[PDB]
Design an enzyme around this catalytic site. Structure first.
Site, PDB file in Angstrom:
ATOM      1  N   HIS A   1       7.427  -5.636 -29.590  1.00 45.45           N
ATOM      2  CA  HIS A   1       8.375  -6.208 -28.653  1.00 45.45           C
ATOM      3  C   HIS A   1       7.922  -7.554 -28.111  1.00 45.45           C
ATOM      4  O   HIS A   1       8.715  -8.231 -27.450  1.00 45.45           O
ATOM      5  CB  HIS A   1       8.730  -5.223 -27.520  1.00 45.45           C
ATOM      6  CG  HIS A   1       7.640  -4.871 -26.555  1.00 45.45           C
ATOM      7  ND1 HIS A   1       7.075  -5.790 -25.705  1.00 45.45           N
ATOM      8  CD2 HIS A   1       7.114  -3.673 -26.212  1.00 45.45           C
ATOM      9  CE1 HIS A   1       6.226  -5.193 -24.902  1.00 45.45           C
ATOM     10  NE2 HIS A   1       6.225  -3.901 -25.189  1.00 45.45           N
TER      11      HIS A   1
ATOM     12  N   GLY B   1       2.750  -6.977 -18.000  1.00 46.31           N
ATOM     13  CA  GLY B   1       1.799  -7.616 -18.883  1.00 46.31           C
ATOM     14  C   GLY B   1       0.663  -6.724 -19.373  1.00 46.31           C
ATOM     15  O   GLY B   1      -0.208  -7.215 -20.105  1.00 46.31           O
TER      16      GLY B   1
ATOM     17  N   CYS C   1       1.082  -4.394 -21.482  1.00 46.77           N
ATOM     18  CA  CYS C   1       1.405  -3.973 -22.841  1.00 46.77           C
ATOM     19  C   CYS C   1       0.317  -4.406 -23.810  1.00 46.77           C
ATOM     20  O   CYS C   1      -0.208  -5.504 -23.721  1.00 46.77           O
ATOM     21  CB  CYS C   1       2.730  -4.596 -23.270  1.00 46.77           C
ATOM     22  SG  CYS C   1       4.044  -4.410 -22.066  1.00 46.77           S
TER      23      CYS C   1
HETATM   24  C1  LIG Z   1      11.126  -5.792 -24.482  1.00 45.66           C
HETATM   25  C2  LIG Z   1      11.052  -4.411 -23.836  1.00 45.66           C
HETATM   26  C3  LIG Z   1      10.702  -3.383 -24.918  1.00 45.66           C
HETATM   27  C4  LIG Z   1      12.433  -4.067 -23.261  1.00 45.66           C
HETATM   28  C5  LIG Z   1      10.014  -4.452 -22.708  1.00 45.66           C
HETATM   29  C6  LIG Z   1      10.187  -5.304 -21.627  1.00 45.66           C
HETATM   30  C7  LIG Z   1       9.264  -5.389 -20.600  1.00 45.66           C
HETATM   31  C8  LIG Z   1       8.081  -4.623 -20.631  1.00 45.66           C
HETATM   32  N1  LIG Z   1       7.117  -4.732 -19.590  1.00 45.66           N
HETATM   33  C9  LIG Z   1       6.215  -5.770 -19.519  1.00 45.66           C
HETATM   34  O1  LIG Z   1       5.511  -5.914 -18.518  1.00 45.66           O
HETATM   35  C10 LIG Z   1       6.068  -6.722 -20.632  1.00 45.66           C
HETATM   36  C11 LIG Z   1       6.697  -6.918 -21.832  1.00 45.66           C
HETATM   37  N2  LIG Z   1       6.096  -7.983 -22.444  1.00 45.66           N
HETATM   38  C12 LIG Z   1       5.136  -8.411 -21.613  1.00 45.66           C
HETATM   39  N3  LIG Z   1       5.077  -7.689 -20.516  1.00 45.66           N
HETATM   40  C13 LIG Z   1       7.275  -3.879 -18.414  1.00 45.66           C
HETATM   41  C14 LIG Z   1       8.389  -2.817 -18.656  1.00 45.66           C
HETATM   42  O2  LIG Z   1       8.176  -1.821 -19.359  1.00 45.66           O
HETATM   43  N4  LIG Z   1       9.587  -2.999 -18.100  1.00 45.66           N
HETATM   44  C15 LIG Z   1      10.745  -2.196 -18.489  1.00 45.66           C
HETATM   45  C16 LIG Z   1      11.802  -2.189 -17.403  1.00 45.66           C
HETATM   46  C17 LIG Z   1      12.990  -1.329 -17.832  1.00 45.66           C
HETATM   47  C18 LIG Z   1      13.580  -1.817 -19.143  1.00 45.66           C
HETATM   48  C19 LIG Z   1      12.523  -1.844 -20.230  1.00 45.66           C
HETATM   49  C20 LIG Z   1      11.327  -2.692 -19.806  1.00 45.66           C
HETATM   50  C21 LIG Z   1       6.101  -3.043 -17.907  1.00 45.66           C
HETATM   51  C22 LIG Z   1       5.806  -2.930 -16.555  1.00 45.66           C
HETATM   52  C23 LIG Z   1       4.757  -2.161 -16.134  1.00 45.66           C
HETATM   53  C24 LIG Z   1       4.031  -1.480 -17.076  1.00 45.66           C
HETATM   54  N5  LIG Z   1       4.290  -1.543 -18.380  1.00 45.66           N
HETATM   55  C25 LIG Z   1       5.314  -2.315 -18.776  1.00 45.66           C
HETATM   56  C26 LIG Z   1       7.893  -3.772 -21.723  1.00 45.66           C
HETATM   57  C27 LIG Z   1       8.840  -3.708 -22.735  1.00 45.66           C
END
Ligand SMILES: CC(C)(C)c1ccc(N(C(=O)c2c[nH]cn2)[C@@H](C(=O)NC2CCCCC2)c2cccnc2)cc1
Ligand SMILES: CC(C)(C)c1ccc(N(C(=O)c2c[nH]cn2)[C@@H](C(=O)NC2CCCCC2)c2cccnc2)cc1
Ligand SMILES: [Cl-]
Ligand SMILES: [Cl-]
Ligand code: NA
Ligand code: NA
Lengths: 306, 305
Positions: free
Chosen positions: B41, B143, B145
């Site tokens: 992603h 961040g 991830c």
């Molecule tokens: C693209 C995709 C798959 C939808 C996504 C988007 C953002 C992230 N999250 C990144 O922080 C992140 C992504 N790239 C860099 N940082 C965060 C995350 O899950 N929010 C979610 C909020 C609900 C919808 C899906 C995403 C995160 C926060 C805290 C701990 N874990 C992860 C993870 C995945």
């Protein structure tokens, strides 16, 4: 999201752990530059653990009576000296993996990571607090002596604890890296025992702030308290006094959440009175006191989940 | 003596963490030999986030779209591909700190250590379990991830988890290192939720054994039970079924303590039916289920690596 007991990454300390053997005794040492630090009780004889005289025991030792093993390499001891309750072995090779480091003596209530080691090899890492009664509630078996506690804020290892002994209730006593014990304890076999412990109030308040940051407010109330009325109540539950210094330290968490420190104190008073009525706070059914304010800011988001 | 939530020493994994940047997105990667592994992603934009076509997004990328940093050193990307939900970036330098390692897929109930990382820099280590609902109750900020979970055996790191995303209840979802998700989750912004969870029975029993080893015995009793009767109680209280294989994995602790598994099961049955009566076990007012039998034996025997 989430909240865990979180240790520092242990690699910088792993690269310093060695095995020290004297006679039939083996324990761990900390290899920094060309010095290995370990508990001086490594030279205590098995026949007299009650009243060793470490000056007299040490003057009888030659350098070759100390075997120091770093992984698979023997390190040659070329001198020794005692500082308080720590033995400093000078070796002919400096540790090429020595990190940036300092020695710090901490205050009760402070937390640190422990790298538990046996025979110079790391077994696991966990978080501890220096208890108000100057013990730590560790997880340590025979031969864990010389394992260290540390923090690594901003890539500098601050060593604050070296493990020496186990007390009768199964909690642990040790020294700073200058060899001075925390608390009244001594490195010989005695009847010594931990005093009655108390709860680290400022840490409980920090953890309630962490719960709010992570989106939980169920335990708040409409009340406030003076600092003195809070301490009068809290001390009846064997909580430590909250000082104005503690109130100041909690300022940033108070600002981030919008909850005045003395309003959070009122919440804590009510939690002590009522219990949790079948609820949890950050996954716990008891009030947690081994996260400091600094720890909470380190781990939690800088934005409250309102 | 004492008993703590204990993680594996993390040094062997720290030497593998790098920062991976694609466009405006930064997260963590795992550098083993000449490949960096990270969540696919990373190639999604916020627009793509709702309905990413990862096949097409990848073909549109080239090697220069990926910036990989190991500390201060840029690693030159010389190829890119995807395996399931993991992006693999071939770099021109093999990581000289690569440990002996394996990729392992774990089962619900198994525990592992997490090295939480931001911007390619290790920040903390903690222990957690794969829940029966295939989430983990991590501690992860934006961040995180690409942070990984692992176990160590002697000198060999078994990587079992790569972090991908946060679910609405604040628990976490990710993959094995071959990019296969744990649980029925997808890597895009959609309606997804943790399912109802259950308690890991074999681990609660292991922790009761740990309590006995550490001198906490008030919950022992004269009674024993059968697997069938206990499993009816387990189901009633949303505990996982106890299998004969669980009883066999606990065998050692049963011998060492003198409490047959079904003897201890009678203790757990009474704790479920009556509660703790204001008492604690190993410093907890809840029944703890994120220690495996192996975790208990390792901590109470002092196994090193
Ligand atoms: C693209 C995709 C798959 C939808 C996504 C988007 C953002 C992230 N999250 C990144 O922080 C992140 C992504 N790239 C860099 N940082 C965060 C995350 O899950 N929010 C979610 C909020 C609900 C919808 C899906 C995403 C995160 C926060 C805290 C701990 N874990 C992860 C993870 C995945
Ligand atoms: C010589 C002296 C000072 C009396 C001593 C003796 C043994 C040890 N302990 C070593 O295991 C050990 C010593 N040298 C190598 N291993 C253990 C220890 O404290 N038992 C105590 C038992 C009561 C009387 C005092 C000693 C230990 C166990 C678990 C965790 N921590 C330490 C520590 C100090
Ligand atoms: Cl301090
Ligand atoms: Cl797709
Ligand atoms: Na490889
Ligand atoms: Na019984």
């Amino acid at each position: 999201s989430g909240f865990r007991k979180m240790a520092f990454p242990s690699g910088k300390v792993e690269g310093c752990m060695v095995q020290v053997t004297c006679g039939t005794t083996t324990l761990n040492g900390l290899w920094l530059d060309d010095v290995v630090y370990c508990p001086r009780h490594v030279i205590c004889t098995s026949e007299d653990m009650l009243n060793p005289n470490y000056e007299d025991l040490l003057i009888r030792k030659s350098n070759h009576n100390f075997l120091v093993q770093a992984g698979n390499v023997q390190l040659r001891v070329i001198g020794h000296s005692m500082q308080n309750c720590v033995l400093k072995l000078k070796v002919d090779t400096a540790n090429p993996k020595t990190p940036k480091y300092k020695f710090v003596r901490i205050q009760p209530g402070q937390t640190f990571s422990v790298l538990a080691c046996y025979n110079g090899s790391p077994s696991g890492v966990y978080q501890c607090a220096m208890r108000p009664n100057f013990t730590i509630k560790g997880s340590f078996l025979n031969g864990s002596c010389g394992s260290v506690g540390f923090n690594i804020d901003y890539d500098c290892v601050s060593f604050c604890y070296m493990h020496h002994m186990e007390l009768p209730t199964g909690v642990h006593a040790g020294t700073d890296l200058e060899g001075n014990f925390y608390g009244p304890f001594v490195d010989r076999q005695t009847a010594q025992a931990a005093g009655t412990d108390t709860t680290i109030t400022v840490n409980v308040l920090a953890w309630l702030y962490a719960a709010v940051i992570n989106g939980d407010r169920w335990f708040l109330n409409r009340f406030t308290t003076t600092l003195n009325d809070f301490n009068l109540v809290a001390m009846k539950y064997n909580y430590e006094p909250l000082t104005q210094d503690h109130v100041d330290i909690l300022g940033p968490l108070s600002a981030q959440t919008g909850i005045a420190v003395l309003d959070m104190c009122a919440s804590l008073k009510e939690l002590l009175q009522n219990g949790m009525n079948g609820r949890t706070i950050l996954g716990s059914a008891l009030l947690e006191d081994e996260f400091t304010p600094f720890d909470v800011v380190r781990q939690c988001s800088g934005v409250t989940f309102q």
